[PDB]
């Protein structure tokens, strides 16, 4: 869902911490999407997320 | 490193139930990667695997 302005990924390594996800985690989520930080995202969502409930 | 044919996946969602990786974790690493096997192995390898150890 369109983040507007764009220039780095730093800022959203910090709101993924915000959430749980430790900067280790954080980082391989990045590395195995190829940077892609809106893949990675889904990645940490599902796994490193709640999957149940 | 090639697998060297192509024509199926499962064959590869086969190996990962071996490695302990649940029907579930294989599937949701699948479509998060855009259904590329090696991108979804690499998930669990990274986060499904041991972190420590």
Same mark, same amino acid.
């Given at each position: !869902?369109? =983040?507007?302005?764009?220039? #780095?990924?730093?800022?959203? %390594?910090?709101?993924?911490?915000?959430? !749980?996800? =430790?900067?280790?985690?954080? #980082?391989?989520?990045?590395? %195995?999407?190829?940077?892609?930080?809106?893949?990675?995202?889904?990645?940490?969502?599902?796994?490193?997320?709640?999957?149940?409930?």
């Amino acid at each position: !869902g369109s =983040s507007g302005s764009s220039g #780095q990924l730093s800022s959203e %390594i910090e709101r993924l911490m915000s959430q !749980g996800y =430790s900067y280790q985690d954080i #980082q391989k989520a990045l590395v %195995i999407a190829h940077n892609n930080i809106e893949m990675a995202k889904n990645i940490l969502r599902e796994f490193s997320g709640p999957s149940s409930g």
